[PDB]
C-alpha cells in the first residue's frame, strides 16, 4: 500500500502495536559473540543491545578492537551510517578513535546528557574553547572551536588532532536537544528541519566517511533518524515514489543492527516524518 493512506488505515484501526510486533518477529537474528566476551562488559551500556559480529565497527588496535557500534550500509539509497551507543566513561577515547579511523565528518547526538534524572551518556566533548580534552588511552586531542545554539538544536565546530601524527580535522557536532523525556514529538517539523541541516553540511555525503549517530542505546531515536533519511532519498531516486515501503526499509536496516525503532510510537512518528518530509522536498 502507499504510505499516507496505510497510515490513516492503521490510525483508524488502532493497530500500531500489531504492526510493530510483526516487524519484531520478522527481524534478523545474527550472532554478537564479540560483544558478549567478559573482557567487554564495561564497554556495553545495556546488556540486551549489542552489535552483530558481521557489521560491527572494529577499532584499529591489536589489544582490544571492540566498540558498541554498527555499520548500516544501504545499497540502493547509496548511504551509510554508523549507529552507536552514547559513550561511557571508559569508552570516550574509543569513540573519538572510531570517528578518526572511519573518516567521519559529522556526529549526530539525539539525547541530552541527563534525562529522567539519570545519566544517558558521558560529557564527551568540551564545553569551553579554552578547556580542551585529551584522551590519553587513544592519543587524541579535542577542542571546541565554535558553538551555535538554536531553539531545537545546537551545532558545534570541533577540532580533532591525532597526537601521534599531528594531523588535524574539523568535525561537526549536530545536537538535537528537544526530544521529550517520554514519548515522541507531537510534530515532526523540528526533527525534519534538523535532518536537513545535517544534510546541508556535507556530513552525509560520499566524499566523507559515514556519519556517526547516537542516542543512549543507539537503536531508538537513532533508528528514526536514518530510517527517515533513507526513505526520503529513495523517494527522490525512484520513478514511482509511492513504491517506497517503510516497513521493508526498516527490516533491511535491522540486518545490520538489532532493535532499530524501540516502540510503536517511534514507528508511527517515522511514518509521520517521511510523509511530511516528502511534501516539502517538492517539489514543495
Residues near ligand JPD (CB under 6 A):
146, 148, 155, 157, 201
Q: How far is the CB of 213 from ligand JPD (least distance, A)?
A: 17
* Nearer of residues 59 and 171 to ligand JPD, judged by Cβ: 171
Would you give the DSSP letter of residue 260?
A: -
The answer for 108, left when phi > 0, alpha when psi is -120 to 50, beta otherwise, is beta
- Residue 217 marked as a ligand binder: yes
* Nearer of residues 67 and 155 to ligand JPD, judged by Cβ: 155
- Residue 257 marked as a ligand binder: no
Please report, to the nearest 10 degrees, the dihedral formed by the alpha carbons of residues 85, 90, 95, 96 taken in order.
150
Question: Does 226 qualify as catalytic in the annotation?
Answer: no
Q: How far is the CB of 207 from ligand JPD (least distance, A)?
A: 15
Q: How far is the CB of 175 from ligand JPD (least distance, A)?
A: 11
Question: How many residues does the structure list for the chain?
Answer: 284
Q: 121, 215, 226, 231: which one is catalytic?
A: 215
Residues 6+ apart with CB under 8 A from 117: none
Nearest-angstrom CA–CA distance, 255 and 218? 15
Would you give the DSSP letter of residue 209?
A: B
227: cell is 530510517
- Residue 218 marked as a ligand binder: yes
- Residue 262 marked as a ligand binder: yes
* Nearer of residues 26 and 129 to ligand JPD, judged by Cβ: 129
* Binding annotation for substrate: 181, 215-221, 262
User: Which residues belong to the active site?
Assistant: 215
Amino acid at each position: 500500500m502507499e504510505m499516507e493512506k496505510e497510515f490513516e488505515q492503521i490510525d483508524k484501526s488502532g493497530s500500531w502495536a500489531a504492526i510493530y510486533q510483526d516487524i519484531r518477529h520478522e527481524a534478523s537474528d545474527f550472532p554478537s559473540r564479540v560483544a558478549k566476551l567478559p573482557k567487554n562488559k564495561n564497554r556495553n551500556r545495556y546488556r540486551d543491545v549489542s552489535p552483530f559480529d558481521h557489521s560491527r565497527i572494529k577499532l584499529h588496535q591489536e589489544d582490544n578492537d571492540y566498540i558498541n557500534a554498527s555499520l548500516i550500509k544501504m545499497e540502493e539509497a547509496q548511504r551509510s551510517y554508523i549507529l552507536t551507543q552514547g559513550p561511557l566513561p571508559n569508552t570516550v577515547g574509543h569513540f573519538w578513535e572510531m570517528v578518526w579511523e572511519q573518516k567521519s565528518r559529522g556526529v549526530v547526538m539525539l539525547n541530552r546528557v541527563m534525562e529522567k534524572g539519570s545519566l544517558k551518556c558521558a560529557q564527551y566533548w568540551p564545553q569551553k574553547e579554552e578547556k580542551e580534552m585529551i584522551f590519553e588511552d587513544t592519543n587524541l586531542k579535542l577542542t571546541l572551536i565554535s558553538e551555535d545554539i538554536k531553539s531545537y538544536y545546537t551545532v558545534r565546530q570541533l577540532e580533532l588532532e591525532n597526537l601521534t601524527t599531528q594531523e588535524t580535522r574539523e568535525i561537526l557536532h549536530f545536537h538535537y536537544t528537544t526530544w521529550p523525556d517520554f514519548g515522541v514529538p507531537e510534530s515532526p517539523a523540528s526533527f525534519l528541519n534538523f535532518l536537513f541541516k545535517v544534510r546541508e553540511s556535507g556530513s552525509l555525503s560520499p566524499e566523507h566517511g559515514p556519519v556517526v549517530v547516537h542516542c543512549s542505546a543507539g537503536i531508538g531515536r537513532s533508528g528514526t533518524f536514518c530510517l527517515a533519511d533513507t526513505c526520503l532519498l529513495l523517494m527522490d531516486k525512484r520513478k514511482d515514489p509511492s513504491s517506497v515501503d517503510i516497513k521493508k526499509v526498516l527490516l533491511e536496516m535491522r540486518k545490520f543492527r538489532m532493535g532499530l525503532i524501540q516502540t510503536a510510537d517511534q514507528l508511527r512518528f517515522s511514518y509521520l516524518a517521511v510523509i511530511e518530509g516528502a511534501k516539502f522536498i517538492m517539489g514543495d
